[PDB]
Amino acid sequence: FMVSLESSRTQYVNQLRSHAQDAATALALSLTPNIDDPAMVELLVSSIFDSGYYSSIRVVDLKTDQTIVERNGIPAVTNVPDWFVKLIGLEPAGGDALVSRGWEQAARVEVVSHPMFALAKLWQSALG
Amino acid sequence: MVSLESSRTQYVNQLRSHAQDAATALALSLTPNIDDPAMVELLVSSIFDSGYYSSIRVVDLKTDQTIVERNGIPAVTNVPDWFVKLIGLEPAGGDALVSRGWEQAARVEVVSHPMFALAKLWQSALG
């Protein structure tokens, strides 16, 4: 725990940085065939940002050096009270998929996404 | 509290599609590996560990019983601000270029929110 703190911290630092880099790389790719359609650019950026996973996303025009589109959330941690979760009562919204073995369905994969960012956003809205 | 109704359905839609995307990718990934229990477990953990999930479960349809399962941290975090300061993460950022042929047109800049990472460090600190 304390013995492994420095290495563990570095792992999370590297993980979060990779998370941000992967999103930028994916978004740049998504924007490439649409860079001259302002509406689509905004749509594609909103798509990614609306998860709540990112403190900020900005697209900068290199010729003019101006912001084309940007989005910002609060970068600090939001401590949402337990009682607000019950009050809001968010449904799990799980997803699933089948794995086949030959022609027979062999297993079902069930996934449930963590609501922490969604709850944080709902709480911020509640406070406003 | 009906004013947040539209916000709620939107976030639920996002959580659903995020989970569905992952279930579909994972099912695909498991397909060539379904008879190798160790590989199934490895692949499930790999996705679970690099994403923001409450749970991932694989059920054997022949027996209707759980094969492998991963469960996550609680819905909200009570990570104290004093612990956040002790860890003292700097912003986690990445950027990429959009080009038009050999011409560079735009730069995309992203900063990832650290709340999930900190929540995980905290749960670990609590042992």
The 3-state secondary structure of B35-84, one letter per residue: CCHHHHHHHHHHHHHCCCEEEEEEEECCCCEEEEEEECCCCCCCCCHHHH
Contact assignment for B57 to A110 by CB distance below 8 Å: yes
B22 lies in the same domain as B84: no
Q: Chain B: give the shortest CA distance to residue A39, in Å.
A: 16
For residue A37, report the phi and psi dihedrals to the nearest 5 degrees.
-115, 95
| Rounded distance between C-alpha atoms, residue B30 and residue B14, angstroms | 24
Which residue is listed with tokens 């978004």? Answer: A27
Length of chain B measured in residues: 127
B93 lies in the same domain as B71: no
B62 lies in the same domain as B97: no
Range of the domain at B107: 78-127
Q: Which two tokens stand for residue A52?
A: 């709540």
Among B36, B55, B77, residue at a domain's last position: B77
Q: Answer whether B73's CB lies under 8 Å from A114's CB.
A: yes
B71 lies in the same domain as B87: no
How many CA atoms lie within 13 Å of A2's alpha carbon, on the beta-carbon side? 0
A90 lies in the same domain as A70: no
B52 lies in the same domain as B109: no
B43 touches chain A (CB under 8 A): no
Query: Residue A47: its chain B contacts at CB < 8 A?
Result: none
Q: What is the dihedral of CA B38, B40, B41, B43, to 10 degrees?
A: 120
Query: If we measure between CA atoms, which residue out of A115, A92, A127, A75 comes closest to residue B76?
Result: A115
| Rounded distance between C-alpha atoms, residue A30 and residue B98, angstroms | 9
Domain count across chain B: 2
| Rounded distance between C-alpha atoms, residue A74 and residue A52, angstroms | 10
A66 lies in the same domain as A86: no
SS3 category, B29: helix
Contact assignment for A125 to B55 by CB distance below 8 Å: no
Query: Residue A96: its chain B contacts at CB < 8 A?
Result: 20, 23
Q: Give the H/E segment covering residue A79.
A: none
A23 lies in the same domain as A41: yes
Contact assignment for A58 to B108 by CB distance below 8 Å: yes
Q: Which CATH number fits the domain that encloses residue B112? A: 6.20.270.20
Q: Answer whether A31's CB lies under 8 Å from A21's CB.
A: no
Q: Chain B: give the shortest CA distance to residue A126, in Å.
A: 8
A44 lies in the same domain as A107: no
Query: If we measure between CA atoms, which residue out of A44, A92, A50 comes closest to residue B12?
Result: A92
Query: If we measure between CA atoms, which residue out of A109, A125, A47, A78 comes closest to residue B81?
Result: A78
A70 lies in the same domain as A86: no
SS3 category, A59: strand
Q: Which two tokens stand for residue B61?
A: 């349809």
B84 lies in the same domain as B119: yes
A73 lies in the same domain as A83: no
| Rounded distance between C-alpha atoms, residue B75 and residue B94, angstroms | 27
Which amino acid, A66? Q
Q: Which two tokens stand for residue B64?
A: 């209707």
Q: Answer whether B111's CB lies under 8 Å from A56's CB.
A: yes
A20: nearest CB among B55, B92, B105: B92
Resolution stated for this PDB structure, in Å: 1.8
